[PDB]
Amino acid sequence: TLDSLARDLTVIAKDGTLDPVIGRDKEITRVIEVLSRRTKNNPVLIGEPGVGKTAIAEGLAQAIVNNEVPETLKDKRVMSLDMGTVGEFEERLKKVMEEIQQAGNVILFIDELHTLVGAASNILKPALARGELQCIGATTLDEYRKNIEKDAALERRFQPVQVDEP
Amino acid sequence: TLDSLARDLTVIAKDGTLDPVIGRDKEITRVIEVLSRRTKNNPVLIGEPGVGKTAIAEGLAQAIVNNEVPETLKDKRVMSLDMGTVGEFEERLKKVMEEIQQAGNVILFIDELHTLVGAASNILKPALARGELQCIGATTLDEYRKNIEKDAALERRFQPVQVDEP
Amino acid sequence: LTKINETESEKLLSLEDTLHERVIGQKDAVNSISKAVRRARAGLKDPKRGSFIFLGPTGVGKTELARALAESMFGDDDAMIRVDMSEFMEKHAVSRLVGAPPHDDGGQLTEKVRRKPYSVILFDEIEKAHPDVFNILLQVLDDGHLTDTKGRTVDFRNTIIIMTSNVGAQELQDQRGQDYETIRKTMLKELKNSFRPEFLNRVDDIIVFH
Amino acid sequence: LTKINETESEKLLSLEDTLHERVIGQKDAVNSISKAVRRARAGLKDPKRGSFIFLGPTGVGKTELARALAESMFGDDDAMIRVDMSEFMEKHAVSRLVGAPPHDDGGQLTEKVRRKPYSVILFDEIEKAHPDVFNILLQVLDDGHLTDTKGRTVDFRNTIIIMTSNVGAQELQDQRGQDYETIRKTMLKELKNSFRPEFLNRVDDIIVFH
Amino acid sequence: LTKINETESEKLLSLEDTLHERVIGQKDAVNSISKAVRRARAGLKDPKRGSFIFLGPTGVGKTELARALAESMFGDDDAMIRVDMSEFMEKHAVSRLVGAPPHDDGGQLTEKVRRKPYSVILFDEIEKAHPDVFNILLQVLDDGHLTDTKGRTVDFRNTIIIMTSNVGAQELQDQRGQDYETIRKTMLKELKNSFRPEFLNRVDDIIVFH
Amino acid sequence: SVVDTVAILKGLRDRYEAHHRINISDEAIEAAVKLSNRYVSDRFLPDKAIDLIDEASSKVRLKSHTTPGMSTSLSEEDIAEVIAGWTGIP
Amino acid sequence: SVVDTVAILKGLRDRYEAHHRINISDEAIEAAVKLSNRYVSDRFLPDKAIDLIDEASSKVRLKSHTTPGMSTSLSEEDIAEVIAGWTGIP
Amino acid sequence: SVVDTVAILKGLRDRYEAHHRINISDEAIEAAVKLSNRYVSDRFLPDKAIDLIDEASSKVRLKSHTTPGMSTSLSEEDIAEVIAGWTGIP
Amino acid sequence: KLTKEELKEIVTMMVNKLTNRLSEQNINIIVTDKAKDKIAEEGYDPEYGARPLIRAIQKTIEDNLSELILDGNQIEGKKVTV
Amino acid sequence: KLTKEELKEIVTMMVNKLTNRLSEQNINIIVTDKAKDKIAEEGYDPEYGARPLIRAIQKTIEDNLSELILDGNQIEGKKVTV
């Protein structure tokens, strides 16, 4: 399985499918080192949209396939979220989580809307809050003010980081 | 499948079922060139209702069947929305989306009410937000102030354009 | 290099002649400031406890200093936070400190400290601001940390705060080159007017600009 | 250790020299306070019934005492509750006592007592607060417990309350070292002005700071 | 065509005879203005930094010019913003600059600049407006950008601002055809009265209408 | 930073020109970088440059795409015209 | 208590170093224990130490993981740097 | 009423002691009844007594459960200690 | 008191905005201490401090530039003053 | 009235925060009555009381420490003063 919404750009980076980044290295060094944490492997980003952040993500993935990733994570692999929908919807999105938790070998980057939704709220957020499953978020604070914060335990789950326009 | 609500006027234009437009050419040139964008293929329109805009749409479709459409889109084809309803409702409307995403060959124009609804909200809007499925909207800003904007990522999904009364 | 060297005394030891790289005059105050912020170490005062009332005009370096301070101290001036006492009236306490119904908003410079725990805080003819703020000003003076509307209490000692006064604009007529001790006293009570001393008593020291 | 020892008289017996560990002056008041809170036991007064009007300035220990009090008494100062009489105007009774339509909100310091049944309550130049509050102030004075907007009535006797006055700021000119009995009287009526005695009559006693 | 041609010197080079297409008199000022706005380029002054005090009457082209200016410059006059100094009294600073409790409202002409970053700003016998505004006037003069009540700081240099004075209505009696240098001086102090020079010192230049 | 942008634009320099079959002239590239940063609030020079760029890359291609030989993108007009098309007063 | 934490950290001392292939120096161990307790409100020294630790254990490994020989974790930097990386003013 | 509670506690008197293998001393029983009512707002003496009781019944058993012979529950400590364990100042 | 030092010293950093912005215009800058001081002379006021200097400078200073911006005789990247 | 007693007496407990916190830094402390008094001299004000003392002290006091914290010559657990 681990397909459809489940996808990765790391091989794609080893496939050279994407762009060598610059300058967010030590920025990524943080984002990288977020995974180190028994507490929170899981960073989130703030900043200006469309600026390269999901490539900054890929920057990790490069540095991953570059093995600029140090040890523990080197086995693990990017997952780039896919967003879409189809009776219920999220249960799928709920479902994949054990799969990747079953994967023992990867990481996902949650992308932008980390959502306070109508149909929602805690979705993976407990399995997030399960204290497992290394993952990454990003947004600008304007959203960040809410979901990660209004819990604050997802704040206790998430590590915020932001970088200015280069 | 790809029928009922799924319909197209392009062949109808090749069928000559409709009216040769005028003057919105370079206007359409924009609307056209919206599709070019890896970022947003998906325009929305502002302006005065009933003025020819959905024919302005058809204007594209003509220029499509005219092959005044340049390369990438030339294979793709108009879809003119059908609005109606029938247990649940939207799941159908939700359903068709993969179908047309499965179509590998078309485009849909979403028409006017791009809706903040009771039963709603994100419907395709994630699959919209999926960063796939070239489509077009239109309204007057009075609505535009909300759905595309209140997300702003649908703003990040939608490109607004408006044209005055000719 | 500063990241490199910063031994934890190179500033201090040189801090005057460090600071002297910037603005002539108030060398003492400069020194005092240097003197002051050294007490920002050693913890001989309250380890949770940086408070400076500028007596001076425009062009007085009030900005410069404060700027250069962390620009010297924290190796950048963006640690600083402008805060307009003109904008301090009655209810901004919320917009100082998180509301939570009354959206939920707090800190013009806080969330920035929530952003930036090592910072500098500028206030403006500060007594211009209302007896409203003096207590939440006192909040700073309180405990040397900063509570929030959500309650979060955060260290000031890891930042700086700045107070400015033109109060002696008249009394400046003295150094407009007279012995400041006149105007020092003469402004002291004058500002001492505006503040219960306890306010003034957590000050590092009052800062003339002559 | 206090958890251990707290025999129920070690404070008391030592409470002066206990308290004396803190702030010089008002030793009597200190004593009185010690004297006072002992009546917080024995139930010879109303077992439901801790009320202290501070006559004093900034730096007067008004805070210290009150702080140290439970910090002494309840072995922490977080029992205390700051309450700004500046913030007591007309309708805060709701924000004192649960609304329920008018959200539903009640107690700036209550829900905190709903949080913390053993506490201390600070009020500010209290007569500064409105004849609005005096009755809900009287609510405290009432019955020695605290009703709520949801109705819940909770013991004050298991907490402390604090009243502060600079009223004699002038009349302080006396001890600025004159016999306080002048200003005592002289402030008494002055504050007695602001309050029907019954208010004042549930006071433990008025607290000068000299 | 202007969209087409606008090489970035055709205005300038012709700007006089450009402007000369409009209002006779103040040709110098016209020139000066032309001269002025050229400094709106080259960034030899502060790239963030367009400030014109009109000395003149009704019919004086004060409007015309300002109108035509961007109508010349920005190829439209709707860049302009009328602002009534009569309407500038004490608290409009909010209605100048976003409130946020005090709805939340800010900028009679700002949000319009928030709307229109390239604009023109008209003020009215401006000293008629209050020492209230001079600082938020100075805000414009400040930094050559515009902070907001939400804090947003936006470039003035990408817009124009206009100041008007009938102050010399008397002193106009001079050019009612006398050498203006009299009234220039004669009005200068007179308006210099109303303003700390620093205000006046970010002016492009004072604009007579003769 | 504006400059890093140029580099990151230089990153995508080959990209959309190999999409748009044109030759990017860094003169333009740095140009809008300043200019957009100057003139464009909303999107970000990390993009909005490329926005202009690709759009310029279009406008050229547009002209170059159909009836108006230069395959390269000029500095100026590519910035300018488009940017003037963005605003005015070239 | 801070100290018991050290012990419970000593409990996991072998744990993540045998994950991170490093040598924990109790000097560090007690260090952050104070230091985190000092500097970190949110997570808990029962963890946040180890947080720092493992993170330090990473940062070393990071350096040690790839191009920067010490396998052991220093007292200071492991605390300090990381903790400075946490905050500043080492 | 506090007293009826005692009776209803006397009702469960055999109950949890036959669960906790102890001997309830009504002295305690009435004690907390007052005391809890005095000191405990939230739960209700119909229970909270027994709460204390069973908890006391635990605390004894706890001591009695494992290494600290009295099977009976004291008046005081059973109330007191536990109640002091509840609050303080025995 | 802000010593003669400070005066001309600030007179320096006064120049900064010029350079840090204009020449950052890109136009070389010459400095005549005398005038600078003559300026600084009139630059510092007791009461207002030298604070007018901002205005003080710009008036003629930006001018002569703006002037010599026009003058076509000696032009950008040069330097001239009074 | 707060007698000379009180002044230097409070000047003591003034030291407490230092010790009760810093040396609780762990750094021995010497006290020069003269200076202490010279301080206390300038320490007490009529109007504000000695209240400035807090500031008064810290300024130089914490400094010379912080200084000698740097000075590497005579260091923690010693004592020096003016």
Residue numbers in the entry:
A (entry chain E), B (entry chain o): 162 to 247, 255 to 286, 295 to 342
C (entry chain H), D (entry chain N), E (entry chain B): 488 to 536, 539 to 591, 596 to 669, 679 to 712
F (entry chain D), G (entry chain J), H (entry chain P): 343 to 410, 466 to 487
I (entry chain G), J (entry chain M): 713 to 794
Original authors' sentences:
The bacterial AAA+ chaperone ClpC associates with the peptidase ClpP to form a central proteolytic machinery of Gram-positive bacteria. ClpC activity crucially relies on cooperation with adaptor proteins including MecA, that target specific substrates while concurrently stimulating ClpC ATPase activity. Here, we report on an unexpected mode of AAA+ chaperone control involving transition between an inactive resting state and a functional hexamer as revealed by determining the cryoEM-structures of S. aureus ClpC in absence and presence of MecA.
Additional extra density caps the hexamer and accounts for the N-terminal domain of MecA, whose structure is unknown. Additionally, binding of MecA to MDs breaks head-to-head MD contacts and is therefore expected to prevent formation of the ClpC resting state. MecA prevents MD interactions and thereby converts ClpC into a canonical and active hexamer. Quantification of co-eluting MecA suggests the formation of a 1:1 ClpC:MecA complex, consistent with the binding stoichiometry determined for B. subtilis ClpC/MecA complexes and mass determination by SLS (767 kDa).
